[PDB]
Amino acid sequence: RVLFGDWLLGEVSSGQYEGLQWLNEARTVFRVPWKHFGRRDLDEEDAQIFKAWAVARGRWPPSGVNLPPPEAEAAERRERRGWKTNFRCALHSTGRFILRQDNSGDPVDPHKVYELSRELGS
């Protein structure tokens, strides 16, 4: 058990997720991909970070499911909107993260930029 915010910072610093990166050396500001789907389904690429959180919460096996390729995709596909919803709510509930800029409008690279709260005491 770790909090989402600490979990997420570990993923950011990993540099393993495209679009999920630190924006300064000081590591006080980072960006998080933030696509607007609406009606549209999430493909696998759209859901990489959301899926990581679900696996973290034991809501999805780390290896995925042992189904055939088409049925494997569709099984995940049908989970991805809830995963996206669960992640974003968790991020909102992480008061440590202060939204600084909202670039989710840009379709070639929609993301949101957060800063670490300058009043973390204990």
Interface residues with Na ion (CB under 5 A) are: 92, 94, 97
* Residue 98 CB partners (closer than 8 Å, separation 6+): 114, 115, 116, 117, 118
Residue type, 30: F
Copy the structure tokens of residue 80: 């991805």
User: What is the smallest separation between the CB atom of 77 and Na ion, expressed in angstroms?
Assistant: 27
Q: Which is nearer to Na ion, 21 or 94 (CB)?
A: 94
* Choice between 10 and 61, CB closer to Na ion: 10
What Å distances lie between residue 115 and 5, 34, 58, 63, CA to CA?
Answer: 12, 16, 28, 33
- The CB-of-3 to Na ion minimum distance in angstroms stands at 12
Instruction: Using the minimum distance from each CB to Na ion, give the nearer residue, 31 or 79.
Output: 31
Give the nearest distance from C-beta 34 to Na ion in angstroms. Answer: 12
